Design a protein around this ligand. Structure first.
Ligand SMILES: *[C@@H]1O[C@H](CO)[C@@H](O[C@@H]2O[C@H](CO)[C@@H](O[C@@H]3O[C@H](CO[C@H]4O[C@H](CO)[C@@H](O)[C@H](O)[C@@H]4O)[C@@H](O)[C@H](O[C@H]4O[C@H](CO)[C@@H](O)[C@H](O)[C@@H]4O)[C@@H]3O)[C@H](O)[C@H]2NC(C)=O)[C@H](O)[C@H]1NC(C)=O
Ligand SMILES: *[C@@H]1O[C@H](CO)[C@@H](O[C@@H]2O[C@H](CO)[C@@H](O[C@@H]3O[C@H](CO[C@H]4O[C@H](CO)[C@@H](O)[C@H](O)[C@@H]4O)[C@@H](O)[C@H](O[C@H]4O[C@H](CO)[C@@H](O)[C@H](O)[C@@H]4O)[C@@H]3O)[C@H](O)[C@H]2NC(C)=O)[C@H](O)[C@H]1NC(C)=O
Ligand SMILES: *[C@@H]1O[C@H](CO)[C@@H](O[C@@H]2O[C@H](CO)[C@@H](O)[C@H](O)[C@H]2NC(C)=O)[C@H](O)[C@H]1NC(C)=O
Ligand SMILES: *[C@@H]1O[C@H](CO)[C@@H](O)[C@H](O)[C@H]1NC(C)=O
Ligand SMILES: *[C@@H]1O[C@H](CO)[C@@H](O)[C@H](O)[C@H]1NC(C)=O
Ligand SMILES: *[C@@H]1O[C@H](CO)[C@@H](O)[C@H](O)[C@H]1NC(C)=O
Ligand SMILES: *[C@@H]1O[C@H](CO)[C@@H](O)[C@H](O)[C@H]1NC(C)=O
Ligand SMILES: *[C@@H]1O[C@H](CO)[C@@H](O)[C@H](O)[C@H]1NC(C)=O
Ligand SMILES: *[C@@H]1O[C@H](CO)[C@@H](O)[C@H](O)[C@H]1NC(C)=O
Ligand SMILES: *[C@@H]1O[C@H](CO)[C@@H](O)[C@H](O)[C@H]1NC(C)=O
Ligand SMILES: *[C@@H]1O[C@H](CO)[C@@H](O)[C@H](O)[C@H]1NC(C)=O
Ligand SMILES: *[C@@H]1O[C@H](CO)[C@@H](O)[C@H](O)[C@H]1NC(C)=O
Ligand SMILES: *[C@@H]1O[C@H](CO)[C@@H](O)[C@H](O)[C@H]1NC(C)=O
Ligand SMILES: *[C@@H]1O[C@H](CO)[C@@H](O)[C@H](O)[C@H]1NC(C)=O
Ligand SMILES: *[C@@H]1O[C@H](CO)[C@@H](O)[C@H](O)[C@H]1NC(C)=O
Ligand SMILES: *[C@@H]1O[C@H](CO)[C@@H](O)[C@H](O)[C@H]1NC(C)=O
Lengths: 124, 445, 446, 123, 444, 123
């Protein structure tokens, strides 16, 4: 079920990421002012879906739910043991723990992929 | 050693304010049912969130604000296609009804007449009708006018449109989820540890009332007392009962409804006459039950104020009828009942209570100026039975002295009637992209 | 050989028309402009200079102008919808002249009218006395009169609590679009501009409404700039943007009393009941020396297109009823129609004084040249004064003739579009088109 | 910054593709007023999706830089790499080959269909 | 050895209900032209399909319901800004117009006088006008009121607005397509093996009438008779024709129209007076043409009801004028013509038929009780010529197996007229995704 | 051919026209009138995205044709492969498997769910 893994550890939660993805659109697909409000709700849901998909594309992650990238992890963002992070901590806790650094990480992911694509075009 | 790894489909969320839509579970010409057209047929889902702790705050809950706004809209929209009564704002000639009137109703009904227009603009007819004194004011057999002729246009509500409350379920739009607090004794502001996710709320019946809360949910363990700031006076206290108090309301006479044409297809309904000796409207509560459910409130108030304090009840302070009395819609008519007999006792550590009531047809609804409505009279005898499931109380004075504290029934905003049901729900936005450290790297160069 | 390569995110664009949205600085609290333009602007202009980019601009074909003139005329109506209708006021009036302590100039301008108005209750009537300007009242045939619009339209009273005072308005592009700004110091409104930058919103432009003379706009950089779609075509107007501000001081000298009655439930009508002291005409003052220097600067710029061996003569307007024959403006809620002939009398051949312009005031206003609707401007109580900066003029030519070396210019004006062009001439809207194709040496590997 | 590369040469501008790609969609994220704004939002989305679909059709999905199997035709404007990439800007270039837009798009679509069929037949 | 393969862009579809948009080929005061503002392409670009069989059912076609609903909406929007004639529901004093009247029309016109409002609220004016008796009822020189005073406000239709039908086209939104049946004998309820796909329908004129359908398409090879349930007397029979019948309708009097302000910019138009002797309205149908046409219909009715079956035609059974007579509008005027002269025959095995017509000005429409429209009078003389391209018949009797059946004209529901031009079209949704077996696997 | 021009063609033959139909959903796209048209436009977008998401989840995001990791079941159909590709068209075929849609889709998601997991450990 949707968010069934919300209290699960980060590692365990990743076992079924798909349920959180299919329900971003299936829940959309399944008085004048009332009509306008409903259109705003539907349009916004689409716009948010697309934003996230574009970011993954820009960062070099396409149809995968999990992508490794080539940006090094900074100990200045977070410096903790991987065993705790993946086995004894949940994603809700984790998101709260590193919510400061999302803007910088995203910028770095974008730059790395941009350089990679140029290098690949030259190497062909 | 390790790099950034991106995960999509991460089961996390943040607080958010969005637009919710309503849904009915399926009578004809029911306003609520007509509007909340979306089926609630799919099984309600509920996913318990094991080991999830979340913070709820009913006083900053925007589900309440939306429900309030949606309700106002339904009333506006429903009264949009109904007969306007502008042509009735004329001088009335009125005398008192003195025939077979009990003392309690002396001076309450007036027999008025006026020269009204009809379909053909050049013609007029004399109309006789009965009005309650609360709807009529004196100008200088005396001359009177309808009470809203100086402030507001009046629209007659359509007799075929029913506003009877039905359960309504509020549902999240895609991208959002509703979290429910299941803790047994939650006071409205703080962490909740037994939580789950649902796609819609349970049904909430949009009952509109003042002072006493009718037909709501009951508490499961005990009477629960909630407020924004407990020791701060001039704040409403919402009391949720675990056992209800039955209240029986009635209008005992047989009213005869007549009608005339004002214009082309524009009908006006009014009380023509009254059959039988005249008696006042009233509501009954069992006396013993009322005393038992008051004692429970008193125990809980002492937990907050001290075991050695004295709790004194008193009636409302004064002001407009809407807040000084208990208002409700019974059988389609608007009642304003005197609760002075309910909040009279002092608590120190087959009988019933009859509350007299008044009926009013010109209603300035939702604490607004302008947009007045006229409630058509209902033919016959009115009777309804309802459950008191809670109270709106205020504490006042703020004195120390003897430590006796005084509580009074309060009026309150209409928002408080929904806050009392929506206290267990919160709306959050889902955010699928997460980032975390790990030892993998890509191998394409 | 070379191969086709596809790139996404290519920084190119094409001219486009799209709906813009209205934004404000989001700081009175009962102002139509502020109420409508609910979106706050970002305090950071976020301007990106486009180094080595040349772009052609055309102010006479600018869709931004057209939108500004569909927004103002839809905004004005939604603000008047929830207000008092004065159809109960369209009754026969019994009127005499106001002759007590009146200056010569006002002898026939103000009338004392009496009529039978409705009351809260439909069966009653009340006698009302009020004063009207003659421009609002016509004779029917102590004589009988009617309000001027009883034969064409309903009159809606503007709500006294709603201000229409212009505030700076920012027009902002929707996503996928960008606004290019022309920064060349002396751009004559058409053609290539080489100092170009990209912005998200325009600067704040105040939607000031006027006719022959512009008010409270921006100033020209360096010299006075004269812009016209076609100088040769005398059917077109010439927009002159002054490089310095010429100040005008306008007054409505009488101290009046505003009274009100109910027409019906919840509905109040406002009118002028009394005037205290001597009755005097409205006046606008402009410095005489400043005005003569201002025209001389305009004349030199006009000469660039006509010759320096000619005569430039100014003259007053003709035709156009009251609306294009006067300088119209709104100060304090009063609508002034000033006589500008005193400003355009000079012939140019190659403290101290003020030029005083008498003005008339009227309360029943037709606006945006519509004829099926009208507004009643409630009177404002007390003596009214305002000041303003001209920042530009609208001129037209009389026409040429056989063997004439004298160019004659008159003040005039067309629709409101001219006033909006004056501020929007430097902005252009384009659509961004990210897909590009080019040749290269990279072949897709298969 | 967005479009700061507009005056840069085609080659130099190739490294700012992520700025323009992000700007549209992150930029995306009274009855008549409400309708007009919804229409504007819907169009921004429709345009985004058409470009993405088209890249998918050509086999360029997920990439900002894509090499294809359509050769450059001598019919289309023919100029040296030394001027196309090193001297000209994208604004100039787009005008130079504006005619051939539909021709190129049709060729790209056909090449991708044949390649996908060939992979399935080989499997 | 086989695995499932996913394919996208697959040429398949499912039946669907969607909203079609209206488009029209490029005066400008016409309501249809104004509403269907979207231009059509000069080339419809129809694609034939080969080896495709589709099942059509016109009776459950939702293109018909949408067309009906959109028409109602357009009429209501068109009248939104027009004058509300509430000041006219006053007592009228009326006498009969007796001068210059033929026996026909002897009691049809009345000369009414009333006190109407003026620009100013303090004045009244006396107005004289001529009304048709169908719009005026006695109160009890007698006192009268307008027929709609006790049910609705009457809105005057704006004289500058034209309701003249212009062919319009219904077009599919993206994701949808319109399938067309090109079977020459198709009867509305079954498989059609000759089909094509279009995005827009042919232009259809939104002509509103009962009994005899005007200015529609003709059958190409033979008269086609269509019915949902042919043996059920509760259903209407829609008879198309393969040859049209020309009908000539006039209003012979030369009317002089006058107008008065009833308020601040609000004008009321009325009949003024009449030039020439008073004569009635009428329609001419050639008798020979009519009999040939009807004989063809009878032959085919026998194909459905038996070779020895006698087919008798008769007039309508009764009810409101709207449903008992041939209601139509031409020249902008509203006509109610008798069909008793067309259906008076029994079939066993230049002589025009003149149908008397009446004119009505206060029109209820679409059977909505609470609405009313006042059609302003038209100056001068009215003439129109139109094509009868089909009939709506309501057969009855035969309950005793008498071998004689009776066919009467009828049906006040406009939906049946819209059905007649949409029977060949169906709307489907395109479904591009699907899964099929193949000899391949996704290799890792 | 053109859009749906392959409607009666064999399944194999029609497989080369997939891009015509694939592109048309987007390339082809009174207060209440405006609202109804706006609703229609929003809905077309939602359907487009729904199908694209399913293809993404199943591991076929960039292709018109994908072999998968789910075996063909005898539950779905027992007809010859040659009758399916050479004799029938897509309309006729689709009618034979009308209620297997939900099971196949669930199986396809599961194959992706397992297939992508191994890569993170390998990297
Ligand atoms: C708290 O909750 C209670 C319980 O739901 C509410 O009480 C109900 O109130 C409604 C509305 O006033 C009552 O509904 C009326 O019932 C009449 C028939 O009553 C008999 O038949 C029913 C059959 O189901 C029995 O249950 C009932 O006991 C009786 O034997 C109808 O005739 C009424 O119809 C009216 O409106 C329609 C509108 O379309 C008209 O056509 C009709 O002619 C007529 O005017 C109506 O449906 C209901 O009976 C009450 N229930 C009980 C148990 O008494 C309280 O009102 C609620 N509290 C508050 C404050 O709202
Ligand atoms: C079935 O189809 C036929 C057509 O095939 C329809 O009949 C036509 O109906 C239209 C509309 O009523 C008629 O058009 C009108 O003609 C009037 C006379 O025009 C004459 O002069 C012009 C040249 O100027 C010639 O082209 C024309 O043939 C005539 O000789 C006009 O006066 C009318 O104009 C109206 O609007 C203008 C607006 O500016 C006003 O100024 C006018 O005063 C007036 O109010 C209009 O153009 C057409 O003539 C009819 N043809 C036939 C053969 O009858 C049927 O009505 C249709 N059936 C049904 C049921 O709808
Ligand atoms: C409200 O009305 C109900 C009846 O509709 C009352 O309940 C009845 O009371 C009598 C007298 O004690 C009993 O004989 C009946 O058996 C009861 N009937 C039911 C259904 O309970 C009830 O007491 C009234 N409530 C109040 C507060 O007056
Ligand atoms: C990330 O690492 C750099 C050193 O390369 C350091 O300067 C920076 O501060 C780190 N990030 C944070 C959040 O400090
Ligand atoms: C009529 O009733 C009013 C109260 O509404 C009362 O004050 C008054 O004295 C009564 N008059 C008579 C004559 O009964
Ligand atoms: C209960 O009330 C106290 C006192 O106001 C408050 O501190 C606490 O957070 C509330 N909530 C819970 C869950 O205890
Ligand atoms: C008001 O009506 C009365 C009616 O008797 C009339 O005499 C009087 O002159 C009217 N007053 C005005 C100002 O028109
Ligand atoms: C503009 O041209 C100069 C050379 O004259 C060059 O140095 C500069 O980088 C160019 N600007 C851009 C944006 O490429
Ligand atoms: C290349 O261009 C020529 C001239 O326009 C044209 O005839 C030829 O068909 C083109 N090549 C391809 C593969 O279409
Ligand atoms: C296309 O070719 C024409 C000449 O045939 C040329 O003028 C044009 O600039 C080229 N590209 C554009 C801008 O369409
Ligand atoms: C006037 O005409 C009607 C028919 O419409 C008739 O019933 C009535 O008797 C006539 N009255 C006169 C004036 O004879
Ligand atoms: C099918 O219908 C079309 C109509 O466009 C016609 O041209 C064609 O000959 C017909 N084919 C047959 C014989 O079914
Ligand atoms: C039309 O044909 C179908 C057979 O396809 C038949 O079932 C139906 O009854 C027919 N309709 C008529 C003419 O009654
Ligand atoms: C049908 O014709 C007969 C002829 O005698 C007539 O009496 C009857 O009233 C007509 N029916 C209708 C509805 O007009
Ligand atoms: C229809 O079937 C015939 C064989 O009878 C075949 O030749 C033709 O190509 C088919 N049409 C289509 C569009 O596949
Ligand atoms: C279909 O697949 C299921 C596996 O989920 C299997 O149990 C069943 O036997 C299969 N059916 C056939 C007959 O292929």
């Amino acid at each position: 079920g949707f968010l069934g893994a919300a209290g699960s550890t980060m590692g365990a939660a990743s076992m079924t990421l798909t349920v959180q993805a299919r329900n971003l659109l299936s829940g959309i697909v399944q008085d004048t002012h009332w009509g306008i409000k409903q259109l705003q709700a539907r349009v916004l849901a689409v716009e948010h879906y697309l934003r996230d998909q574009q970011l993954l594309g820009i960062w070099g992650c396409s149809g995968k739910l999990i992508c490794c990238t080539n940006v090094p992890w900074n100990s200045s963002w977070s410096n903790r043991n991987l065993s705790e992070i993946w086995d004894n901590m949940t994603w809700l806790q984790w998101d709260k723990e590193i919510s400061n650094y999302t803007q910088i990480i995203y910028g770095l992911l974008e730059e790395s992929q941009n350089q990679q694509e140029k290098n690949e075009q030259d190497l062909l």
